[PDB]
Structure formats: structure tokens, C-alpha cells
């Protein structure tokens, strides 16, 4: 099927997470063609398309997405744009820092921070969960990575990281805030990388700052200080970005009260199912870009070498073929469901060690579970009249008010 509009890029800006879905539904097909972001594109959705998208002998990420994305969210020529052994090699560096022990450490640091914040929250009239989450996550990420963070800069650094994330799907001022923040963060961290290499800043083996600073490539040389800052930033920024999920989770608890008592008398199992349903239900990761390496035929369609492709993440996560009542928030849908690396992909599909799948999934899950637990057992609060609406046409999305909590009290 072929969409002939000449304003698809603009249409994409207006539809956000619904661009692809609106069309895979209008053409009654898992894929379609279109001129987007200056190139010929094939958009596809579904778990099977996902399997094809993650087949590395047919798809490469090099030169896939616009530079405007590198200059804002990811950093220029970072791991997101790599392929082959070089990608795998650096991918192992990220994974070694995101294993169960690290996931555990971070969720526990987050847990002690949430508890310490209670004393402060009780005295406040209102609290904006999104802002609280940002600063706390930033403070934890840095501490855990071994990155020095002064009390008077937590706010600024936290905001810089968010400006980066909030700039990939926009034009105008939103994109510019990210375009300026990235340079401030990379510089801040590059000096750190350099002092560590000279032993002027204490670093600890096994921590992100250290590992990024001393990592060696396939040719045996270490990354340019700047690339090491970028790659370390590709660890700190994402963690801070967990803020959006934390807000969505709290919003799910408020929008679907029945589950509150459910989790409160349940265990780690209930929290795990609620946490998964939040990652599946709400929008965060839009879609991914890849480049067709060689000509191949799939689904009776021919993919020419060089054509660009977008894999719909939001849409696949809401595919009725995989999810009964996809558009309903139902944590119980996760009770006893054999794992599958392609049916749900809010943070990518496939194998993390074999492809570009997000290596921070475990951390994302454990931090959300820890944060959910805190909101369920540790405190009591009100959700005053506010705008909780979250647009599906804005990437990333977030409840307008950022989730405001008042009359907070320890439980
Ligand atoms: C907060 C929500 C998060 C979302 C929704 C998210 C989403 C994603 C997506 C969709 C990709 C691309 C997958 C692909 O290209 O196939 C990805 C990659 C990545 N994420 Fe996540 N992520 C998040 C959190 C985290 C955390 C907390 C960390 C660090 C602890 C992290 C580190 C990374 C890295 C390094 C990559 C690049 C991997 C590669 O290219 O091989 N992420 N993530």
C-alpha cells in the first residue's frame, strides 16, 4: 500500500504515536510505503514485523534516523547508530552495568530516597511527582554511577537530561532546549572522564563512570573522552527518563482504583504485573528506524536495499492479535504468560546481547516496582482537581499537570 501525501513528515508531527497505527488500520495492512523524513519509508507494525526488523542480516541502524535525533536524544555517533561486532562489543559494556545486582542496587537507593522525601512532602501544600522523580532519579543515577553531583546542580542537571528526551519528537523551542542541553551535559561529563583517566577523581571498578572511562574498543584503544561522556550520558539520561513511567504508574493507580487494594494485599507478583501493564499500556517509545541492508521479500512485499523502515512500538503493544482488549489497562492480563521477546516491545524487542534492544529494561522494571510499592504502602495522599490528560500526539507524552499530590501523609 502507498500513502501519496507530500506532508507525511508534518502529518507525523501532528499524529505522534498514532501516525503508523492510523494507517496500518486505514490500509488494513501490517505495512505501508511513504515519503517521510526526507526519504522513502516502509512503516510496519506487529510482532512478526518486529522479528523481521530485528533480523540483523537484513537491517542496519547506521544512517537510519535523522541527525536531529543524535544531536538531541542520543548524542552523535553513539551506540544507537552502530552495527556489527563493534556494536555488540560496546553493547556488552552497557549490559555489564545493568545486570540484576545493579537493578537491585538502584531500586534500593530509590527506595531510601522515597522514604526520606516523606518528611519533606508532608510539609508541602502540593508536590509534582514528575519533578520530584526527576531530581531523585538524577541524584540516584549519579551516585550509583560514581558521578559527582553537587546539591545546587541536581535541578539543572535533571532538567537538562529531560530537555534531551523531550526534544526528539518536536520542532521549534522544545527541540532547541534539547539542542542546548546536550552540549552542557557532554562537557560536564567529558571533564569528568578526563580527570578520572588521570586519577584526579576517585572512580570505582564496576561503576558506570569507571567502566565508560576505561573501556577499550575492538582495536584495543579507549573511546575519545567525548564519546565516553556521550555513552555515560546514554546511561544517566535514560534512568532519569524513568520519571515518565513513574507518573504513568501513579496515574494508573488513580484512574483504576480497584487495583490499589489488589496490590496492597498482594505481593511482588501483583506489582510486577501492574508494572508490565503500565509499560505496555501508556506511550513512551514511539517507533524505531532502520535501514534495509539487502533486497528481501517478506509478507509478499519486497524491501529494496537502502529503503528506510519504521517499526511501530506503540501499535504493536496495542495489537489485538496479542492482547485481549489491548486498549484497557488490565494488569491481570499478565498472570501466567510465557515470555516472548516480540509480543510486547515498549523498550524494543529481540535479544539485547544480539541487537539494539534496551539493556535498561531490568532497571526500569525494578525502579518502577520499588516506586509503585512506595506509593501503595508508604504514604497516603489526595489527587486534587488538575489536568491529567496525556496527548498521544506529543512525543514523549505525560499527564499535563505532571501528577499533583496534596495532603500527603505517612502510612
Ligand atoms: C525510561 C524508559 C525507557 C524507555 C521507554 C526506553 C526505550 C528504549 C528503546 C525503544 C530503545 C531502542 C531499541 C532498538 O533500537 O531496538 C532503547 C535503547 C537503549 N536504552 Fe532504553 N529505555 C528506557 C530506559 C533505560 C534505562 C533506565 C537505561 C539505563 C540504565 C537505558 C539504556 C538504553 C541504551 C544504552 C540503549 C541503546 C542500546 C543499543 O543501541 O544497543 N534505558 N531504549
From Swiss-Prot:
Q: Kindly list the GO molecular function terms attached to this UniProt entry.
A: heme binding; iron ion binding; monooxygenase activity; oxidoreductase activity, acting on paired donors, with incorporation or reduction of molecular oxygen
Keyword list, A-Z: Heme, Iron, Metal-binding, Monooxygenase, Oxidoreductase
Gene3D superfamilies per UniProt = Cytochrome P450
Q: Does the keyword Iron apply?
A: yes
- Pfam families, from UniProt? p450
Whether Plastid counts among this entry's keywords is: no
Q: Which residues does the record give as heme binding sites?
A: 358
Q: Which cofactor does it need?
A: heme
Q: What is its EC number?
A: 1.11.2.4
Top-level class of the enzyme under EC nomenclature: oxidoreductase
Name the chemical reaction catalysed here: a 1,2-saturated fatty acid + H2O2 = a 2-hydroxy fatty acid + H2O; a 2,3-saturated fatty acid + H2O2 = a 3-hydroxy fatty acid + H2O; tetradecanoate + H2O2 = (3R)-hydroxytetradecanoate + H2O; tetradecanoate + H2O2 = (2R)-hydroxytetradecanoate + H2O
Q: Which family does it belong to?
A: Belongs to the cytochrome P450 family.
Protein function: Catalyzes the alpha- and beta-hydroxylation of myristic acid in the presence of hydrogen peroxide.
The name this protein carries in UniProt is: Fatty-acid peroxygenase
What is the organism of origin for this protein? Bacillus subtilis (strain 168)
The protein's gene is named cypC
Amino acid at each position: 500500500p502507498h500513502d501519496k501525501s507530500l506532508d507525511n513528515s508534518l502529518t507525523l508531527l501532528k499524529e505522534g504515536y498514532l501516525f503508523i497505527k492510523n494507517r496500518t488500520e486505514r490500509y488494513n495492512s501490517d505495512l505501508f510505503q511513504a515519503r517521510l523524513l526526507g526519504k522513502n519509508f516502509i512503516c510496519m507494525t506487529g510482532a512478526e514485523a518486529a522479528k523481521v526488523f530485528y533480523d540483523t542480516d537484513r537491517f542496519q541502524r547506521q544512517n537510519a534516523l535523522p541527525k536531529r535525533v543524535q544531536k538531541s536524544l542520543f548524542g552523535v555517533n553513539a551506540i544507537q547508530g552502530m552495527d556489527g561486532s563493534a556494536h555488540i562489543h560496546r553493547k556488552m559494556l552497557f549490559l555489564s552495568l545493568m545486570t540484576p545486582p545493579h537493578q537491585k542496587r538502584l531500586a534500593e537507593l530509590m527506595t531510601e530516597e522515597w522514604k526520606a522525601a516523606v518528611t519533606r512532602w508532608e510539609k508541602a501544600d502540593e508536590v509534582v511527582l514528575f519533578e520530584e522523580a526527576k531530581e531523585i532519579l538524577c541524584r540516584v543515577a549519579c551516585y550509583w554511577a560514581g558521578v559527582p553531583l553537587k546539591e545546587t546542580e541536581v535541578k539543572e542537571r535533571a532538567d537538562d537530561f529531560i530537555d534531551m528526551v523531550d526534544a526528539f519528537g518536536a520542532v521549534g523551542p522544545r527541540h532547541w532546549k534539547g539542542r542546548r542541553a546536550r552540549p552542557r551535559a557532554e562537557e560536564w561529563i567529558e571533564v569528568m572522564i578526563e580527570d578520572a583517566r588521570a586519577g584526579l577523581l576517585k572512580t570505582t571498578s564496576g561503576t558506570a563512570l569507571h567502566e565508560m572511562a576505561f573501556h577499550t574498543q575492538e582495536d584495543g584503544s579507549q573511546l575519545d573522552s567525548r564519546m565516553a561522556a556521550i555513552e555515560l550520558i546514554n546511561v544517566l539520561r535514560p534512568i532519569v527518563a524513568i520519571s515518565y513511567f513513574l507518573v504513568f504508574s501513579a496515574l494508573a493507580l488513580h484512574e483504576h482504583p480497584k487495583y490499589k487494594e489488589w496490590l496492597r494485599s498482594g505481593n511482588s507478583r501483583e506489582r510486577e504485573m501492574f508494572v508490565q501493564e503500565v509499560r505496555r499500556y501508556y506511550p513512551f517509545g514511539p517507533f524505531l528506524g532502520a535501514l534495509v541492508k539487502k533486497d528481501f521479500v517478506w509478507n509478499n512485499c519486497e524491501f529494496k536495499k537502502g529503503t528506510s523502515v519504521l517499526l511501530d512500538l506503540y501499535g504493536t503493544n496495542h495489537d489485538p492479535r496479542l492482547w485481549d482488549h489491548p486498549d484497557e489497562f488490565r494488569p491481570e492480563r499478565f498472570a501466567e504468560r510465557e515470555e516472548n521477546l516480540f509480543d510486547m516491545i515498549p523498550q524494543g524487542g529481540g535479544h539485547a546481547e544480539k541487537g539494539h534492544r534496551c539493556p535498561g529494561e531490568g532497571i526500569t522494571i525494578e525502579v518502577m516496582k520499588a516506586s509503585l510499592d512506595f506509593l501503595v504502602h508508604q504514604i497516603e495522599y489526595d489527587v486534587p482537581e488538575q489536568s491529567l490528560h496525556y496527548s498521544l500526539a506529543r512525543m514523549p507524552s505525560l499527564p499535563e499537570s505532571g501528577f499533583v499530590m496534596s495532603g500527603i501523609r505517612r502510612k
